């Protein structure tokens, strides 16, 4: 139900940075709670 079977950005070990960042490494199998923030590794 939705798109895929991703996990929580805080459930594993990630962070939510600004989508307009220049130094953000987007990680899969996980998403952010905000609709304007991406779940990056660090």
UniProtKB/Swiss-Prot annotation:
Gene Ontology CC: one annotated term: extracellular region
Expressed in which tissues: Produced by the crural gland and detected in venom from the spur located on each male hind leg. Is also widely expressed in both male and female tissues, including brain, intestine, kidney, lung, spleen and testis.
Compartments where found: Secreted
Organism domain of life: Eukaryota
Residues with D-methionine modification: 2
Keyword annotations from UniProtKB, A to Z: D-amino acid, Disulfide bond, Secreted, Signal, Toxin
Main location: secreted
UniProt KW Transmembrane helix keyword: no
Free-text description of this protein's post-translational modifications in UniProt: Stereoinversion of L-Met-26 (in DLP-4) to D-Met-26 (in DLP-2).
Disulphide bridges: 9-39, 16-32, 24-40
GO molecular function, one term: toxin activity
Function: Does not show antimicrobial, myotoxic, hemolytic and cell-promoting activities.
Protein name (Swiss-Prot/TrEMBL): Defensin-like peptide 2/4
Organism whose genome encodes this protein: Ornithorhynchus anatinus (Duckbill platypus)
